[PDB]
Amino acid sequence: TKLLVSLKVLVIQLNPQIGQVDQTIKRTWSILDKVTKSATYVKPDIILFPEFALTGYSFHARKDILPYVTKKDEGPSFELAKSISEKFQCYTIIGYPEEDDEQKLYNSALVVNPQGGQIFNYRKTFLYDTEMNWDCEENPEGFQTFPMDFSKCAKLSNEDSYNRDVTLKASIGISMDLSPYKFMAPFNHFEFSSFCVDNNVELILCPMAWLNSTSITDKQTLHNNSLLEAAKNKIAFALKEQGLPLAGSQGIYQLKIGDSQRTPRVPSDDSTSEYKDMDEPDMSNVNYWILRFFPFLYFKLRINWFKNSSLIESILGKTRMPLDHEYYKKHKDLLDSEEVIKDTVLEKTFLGTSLGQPWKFQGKNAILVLANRCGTEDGTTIFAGSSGIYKFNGKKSSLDSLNESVELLGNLGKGLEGAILREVQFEVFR
């Protein structure tokens, strides 16, 4: 049974700096006020914030992050999300640094329902270099899905209003979750997006603190004080030339509330990575994010992969998580056994192909919401901003925004705090 859904999605893009939690909260309430006063404001069903949205990101030691960590149901990030959810009768998702009862630290994202109740807490699964500075743990559950009950968001195709309720299968992926494991696994594993396709996820939510490539990431540079000073001067100049303070822009809000302006499809080139034009998205990163969701993208070659059974061993052989992942610290060849083939094996994909069809996602819909922070930290790290909303339409070979099986419903700029609201329409099957 086809069910039509209409979701009002609001993404908040912030430039949080370490030690400014109260100020960031104040700016958040200011943004939300401005949003409600927009000409084409409508109430959101879901509000998504970035990774470590109120605290800043680049913590260099456990001691430095400890004053900002909280249990999943206490503290500033949780209280903010509960107040937002109660004021807008929506789901609210925010990234925050978490401590549990056993003194373990995580990079997490809590989910609050419209009743102000915490319904989920997701922990980052693939860690980035920065997390290793302060003793962050990998999510022992690996990637996860969860149900979100949306009220009055759905209809049958012959009905004239969205008066039905729908429970969507959702997944949160926090920034590095989208990358090859440790940047060492093969690029074409696409672990997170494969997991979402494997599990028939419908709503993908990604709080991020994702870098623009102007950032200094070269390890020899970071650890040679001479090279680092020279590199930092380069970033200093690039910000000064833009009329920006070194930390980047704060408190000047770009609002795209309820318009329908789409993001132009563009290929990556030498210039699309430049940290210029703060109100325009970083298309180098937009294209890369889209690429990391390859299993959701139409690709002609899959018919040949399927016809030749080229990926059967890859599909059968792939494990739920990387073998060295926290996940297996759970229990790790159906071709050579008397055990039958289970449904779950027939749901498995590699490169978007399953044992049963060339492209498993074909004819389906999924919504991707990316909330990426903006600004700069340490004089070395420039976040890409460019928060956006995307629809994978499942319709039947560019590996970027030119691929028309993804729809770019709208993006914020790379360098300004702000908010984007889009009504997103798609279908699910029930």
Side-chain angles (χ1 to χ4, degrees), residues 34 56 59 193-194 204 250 262 277 286 310 325 377 430:
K34 289 186 168 47
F59 293 94
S193 54
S194 292
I204 313 159
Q250 289 173 314
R262 309 316 189 187
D277 301 332
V286 168
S310 310
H325 190 272
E377 295 182 328
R430 290 292 181 268

PDB file of all heavy atoms in Angstrom, residues 34 56 59 193-194 204 250 262 277 286 310 325 377 430:
ATOM      1  N   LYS A  34      13.218  34.362  14.790  1.00  0.00           N
ATOM      2  CA  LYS A  34      13.205  34.903  13.437  1.00  0.00           C
ATOM      3  C   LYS A  34      12.502  33.961  12.461  1.00  0.00           C
ATOM      4  O   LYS A  34      11.807  34.406  11.548  1.00  0.00           O
ATOM      5  CB  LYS A  34      14.627  35.183  12.959  1.00  0.00           C
ATOM      6  CG  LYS A  34      15.311  36.365  13.648  1.00  0.00           C
ATOM      7  CD  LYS A  34      16.666  36.654  13.012  1.00  0.00           C
ATOM      8  CE  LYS A  34      17.228  37.999  13.478  1.00  0.00           C
ATOM      9  NZ  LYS A  34      17.122  38.153  14.957  1.00  0.00           N
ATOM     10  N   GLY A  56      30.859  23.358  20.660  1.00  0.00           N
ATOM     11  CA  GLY A  56      32.082  23.466  19.874  1.00  0.00           C
ATOM     12  C   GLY A  56      32.574  22.046  19.650  1.00  0.00           C
ATOM     13  O   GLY A  56      32.024  21.098  20.239  1.00  0.00           O
ATOM     14  N   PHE A  59      37.921  19.548  20.736  1.00  0.00           N
ATOM     15  CA  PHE A  59      38.476  19.326  22.072  1.00  0.00           C
ATOM     16  C   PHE A  59      39.765  18.517  21.967  1.00  0.00           C
ATOM     17  O   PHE A  59      39.833  17.540  21.215  1.00  0.00           O
ATOM     18  CB  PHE A  59      37.466  18.606  22.973  1.00  0.00           C
ATOM     19  CG  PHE A  59      36.252  19.436  23.298  1.00  0.00           C
ATOM     20  CD1 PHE A  59      35.103  19.338  22.531  1.00  0.00           C
ATOM     21  CD2 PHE A  59      36.269  20.321  24.361  1.00  0.00           C
ATOM     22  CE1 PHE A  59      33.998  20.108  22.820  1.00  0.00           C
ATOM     23  CE2 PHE A  59      35.169  21.091  24.660  1.00  0.00           C
ATOM     24  CZ  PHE A  59      34.032  20.986  23.889  1.00  0.00           C
ATOM     25  N   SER A 193      25.644   4.247   4.235  1.00  0.00           N
ATOM     26  CA  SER A 193      24.536   4.319   3.291  1.00  0.00           C
ATOM     27  C   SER A 193      24.076   2.912   2.874  1.00  0.00           C
ATOM     28  O   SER A 193      22.901   2.704   2.554  1.00  0.00           O
ATOM     29  CB  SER A 193      24.921   5.151   2.063  1.00  0.00           C
ATOM     30  OG  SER A 193      26.114   4.677   1.473  1.00  0.00           O
ATOM     31  N   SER A 194      25.004   1.956   2.864  1.00  0.00           N
ATOM     32  CA  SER A 194      24.642   0.558   2.614  1.00  0.00           C
ATOM     33  C   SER A 194      23.740   0.037   3.725  1.00  0.00           C
ATOM     34  O   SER A 194      22.735  -0.625   3.463  1.00  0.00           O
ATOM     35  CB  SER A 194      25.898  -0.331   2.494  1.00  0.00           C
ATOM     36  OG  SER A 194      26.634  -0.009   1.324  1.00  0.00           O
ATOM     37  N   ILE A 204      16.869   9.729   6.843  1.00  0.00           N
ATOM     38  CA  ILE A 204      18.271   9.733   7.264  1.00  0.00           C
ATOM     39  C   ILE A 204      18.659  11.106   7.822  1.00  0.00           C
ATOM     40  O   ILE A 204      18.540  12.114   7.124  1.00  0.00           O
ATOM     41  CB  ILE A 204      19.201   9.354   6.084  1.00  0.00           C
ATOM     42  CG1 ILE A 204      18.650   8.116   5.363  1.00  0.00           C
ATOM     43  CG2 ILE A 204      20.647   9.124   6.587  1.00  0.00           C
ATOM     44  CD1 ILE A 204      19.138   7.944   3.946  1.00  0.00           C
ATOM     45  N   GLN A 250      29.230  34.650  13.279  1.00  0.00           N
ATOM     46  CA  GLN A 250      28.240  34.311  14.294  1.00  0.00           C
ATOM     47  C   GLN A 250      27.189  35.409  14.349  1.00  0.00           C
ATOM     48  O   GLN A 250      27.512  36.585  14.166  1.00  0.00           O
ATOM     49  CB  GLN A 250      28.882  34.159  15.677  1.00  0.00           C
ATOM     50  CG  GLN A 250      29.745  32.934  15.873  1.00  0.00           C
ATOM     51  CD  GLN A 250      30.460  32.961  17.204  1.00  0.00           C
ATOM     52  OE1 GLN A 250      31.034  33.980  17.593  1.00  0.00           O
ATOM     53  NE2 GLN A 250      30.431  31.846  17.914  1.00  0.00           N
ATOM     54  N   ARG A 262      15.786  25.660  -5.097  1.00  0.00           N
ATOM     55  CA  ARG A 262      16.584  24.441  -5.111  1.00  0.00           C
ATOM     56  C   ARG A 262      18.042  24.782  -5.328  1.00  0.00           C
ATOM     57  O   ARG A 262      18.365  25.835  -5.873  1.00  0.00           O
ATOM     58  CB  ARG A 262      16.117  23.474  -6.210  1.00  0.00           C
ATOM     59  CG  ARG A 262      14.625  23.170  -6.241  1.00  0.00           C
ATOM     60  CD  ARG A 262      14.073  22.918  -4.853  1.00  0.00           C
ATOM     61  NE  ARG A 262      12.696  22.431  -4.887  1.00  0.00           N
ATOM     62  CZ  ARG A 262      11.942  22.265  -3.804  1.00  0.00           C
ATOM     63  NH1 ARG A 262      12.435  22.555  -2.605  1.00  0.00           N
ATOM     64  NH2 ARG A 262      10.702  21.806  -3.917  1.00  0.00           N
ATOM     65  N   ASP A 277      32.433  33.297  -0.649  1.00  0.00           N
ATOM     66  CA  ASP A 277      30.973  33.381  -0.832  1.00  0.00           C
ATOM     67  C   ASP A 277      30.198  32.672   0.281  1.00  0.00           C
ATOM     68  O   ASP A 277      29.593  31.613   0.054  1.00  0.00           O
ATOM     69  CB  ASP A 277      30.546  32.787  -2.188  1.00  0.00           C
ATOM     70  CG  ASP A 277      31.206  33.479  -3.377  1.00  0.00           C
ATOM     71  OD1 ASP A 277      31.549  34.678  -3.270  1.00  0.00           O
ATOM     72  OD2 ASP A 277      31.375  32.821  -4.428  1.00  0.00           O
ATOM     73  N   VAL A 286      29.094  19.110  -0.989  1.00  0.00           N
ATOM     74  CA  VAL A 286      27.752  18.637  -1.330  1.00  0.00           C
ATOM     75  C   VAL A 286      27.859  17.450  -2.284  1.00  0.00           C
ATOM     76  O   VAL A 286      27.211  16.424  -2.081  1.00  0.00           O
ATOM     77  CB  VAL A 286      26.897  19.760  -1.927  1.00  0.00           C
ATOM     78  CG1 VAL A 286      25.618  19.214  -2.549  1.00  0.00           C
ATOM     79  CG2 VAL A 286      26.573  20.778  -0.836  1.00  0.00           C
ATOM     80  N   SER A 310      28.356 -10.495 -10.473  1.00  0.00           N
ATOM     81  CA  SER A 310      29.711 -10.046 -10.129  1.00  0.00           C
ATOM     82  C   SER A 310      29.892  -9.728  -8.651  1.00  0.00           C
ATOM     83  O   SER A 310      31.015  -9.744  -8.156  1.00  0.00           O
ATOM     84  CB  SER A 310      30.084  -8.804 -10.948  1.00  0.00           C
ATOM     85  OG  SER A 310      29.837  -9.017 -12.328  1.00  0.00           O
ATOM     86  N   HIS A 325      35.655  -3.464  14.775  1.00  0.00           N
ATOM     87  CA  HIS A 325      34.846  -2.421  15.376  1.00  0.00           C
ATOM     88  C   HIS A 325      34.385  -2.839  16.767  1.00  0.00           C
ATOM     89  O   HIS A 325      34.268  -4.029  17.061  1.00  0.00           O
ATOM     90  CB  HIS A 325      33.632  -2.083  14.487  1.00  0.00           C
ATOM     91  CG  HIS A 325      32.891  -0.859  14.935  1.00  0.00           C
ATOM     92  ND1 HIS A 325      31.874  -0.897  15.863  1.00  0.00           N
ATOM     93  CD2 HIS A 325      33.052   0.449  14.610  1.00  0.00           C
ATOM     94  CE1 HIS A 325      31.429   0.328  16.084  1.00  0.00           C
ATOM     95  NE2 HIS A 325      32.128   1.163  15.333  1.00  0.00           N
ATOM     96  N   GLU A 377      37.799  26.664  13.902  1.00  0.00           N
ATOM     97  CA  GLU A 377      38.408  26.419  15.215  1.00  0.00           C
ATOM     98  C   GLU A 377      39.919  26.211  15.119  1.00  0.00           C
ATOM     99  O   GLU A 377      40.418  25.691  14.118  1.00  0.00           O
ATOM    100  CB  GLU A 377      37.752  25.207  15.897  1.00  0.00           C
ATOM    101  CG  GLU A 377      36.257  25.441  16.254  1.00  0.00           C
ATOM    102  CD  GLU A 377      35.622  24.260  16.980  1.00  0.00           C
ATOM    103  OE1 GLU A 377      36.022  23.096  16.723  1.00  0.00           O
ATOM    104  OE2 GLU A 377      34.714  24.494  17.806  1.00  0.00           O
ATOM    105  N   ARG A 430       3.455   0.502   2.916  1.00  0.00           N
ATOM    106  CA  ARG A 430       3.038  -0.039   4.206  1.00  0.00           C
ATOM    107  C   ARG A 430       2.143  -1.273   4.063  1.00  0.00           C
ATOM    108  O   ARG A 430       1.418  -1.407   3.078  1.00  0.00           O
ATOM    109  CB  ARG A 430       2.317   1.045   5.010  1.00  0.00           C
ATOM    110  CG  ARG A 430       3.233   2.156   5.506  1.00  0.00           C
ATOM    111  CD  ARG A 430       4.178   1.621   6.556  1.00  0.00           C
ATOM    112  NE  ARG A 430       5.072   2.652   7.078  1.00  0.00           N
ATOM    113  CZ  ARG A 430       6.284   2.916   6.594  1.00  0.00           C
ATOM    114  NH1 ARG A 430       6.768   2.229   5.560  1.00  0.00           N
ATOM    115  NH2 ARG A 430       7.013   3.874   7.152  1.00  0.00           N
TER     116      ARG A 430
END
